Paper text:
Approximately 2–6% of ALS cases are caused by mutations in the antioxidant enzyme Cu, Zn-superoxide dismutase (SOD1). In contrast, wild-type-like mutants, such as A4V, D90A, G93A, D101G, and D101N, retain most of their physiological activities similar to those of wild-type SOD1. Here, we report the cryo-EM−determined atomic structures of homogeneous amyloid fibrils assembled in vitro from apo, reduced forms of the ALS-causing SOD1 mutants G93A and D101N. The AFM images, cryo-EM micrographs, and two-dimensional (2D) class average images using RELION3.1 revealed that both G93A and D101N self-assembled amyloid fibrils made of a single protofilament with a left-handed helical twist.
Numbering used by the authors:
A (entry chain C), B (entry chain B), C (entry chain A): 95 to 153
Amino acid sequence: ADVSIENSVISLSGDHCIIGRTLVVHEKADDLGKGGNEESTKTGNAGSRLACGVIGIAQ
Amino acid sequence: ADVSIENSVISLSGDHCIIGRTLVVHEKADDLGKGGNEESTKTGNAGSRLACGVIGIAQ
Amino acid sequence: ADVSIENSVISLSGDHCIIGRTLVVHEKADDLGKGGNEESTKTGNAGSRLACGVIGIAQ
């Protein structure tokens, strides 16, 4: 029960909640990606990663 | 139960909540990404990462 | 129950809440990103990260 924090970065967040009766979403997209290069070295992913997309409802 | 904080950065946040009866969203996008380069080295992701997108409702 | 804070940065926030009966959102976007470079080294993400987007309703 001894914590030692140093030259480091820490971030938290609380709990999000949306409570409704009706949820509607309309979307039109026309020209999103037009030759966008992308590089990645030693990255690792555990959630939802995406380039040039249209989600609709992300959680 | 001894905490030691040093040359470090710490951030928190509380709980967000939206309570409604009706939720509507309209969206038109035309030209978002037009040759945007992107580099990443030793990044790691655990949430929702995206380049050049249209979400609609992000949580 | 001994806390030791030093040459460090700490930030908090309370709880946000929106309570309504009707929630409407209209959006038109035309030209957002036009060759915006982006670099990242040793970053790490746990929430919602995005470049050149149109959210609609972010939480």
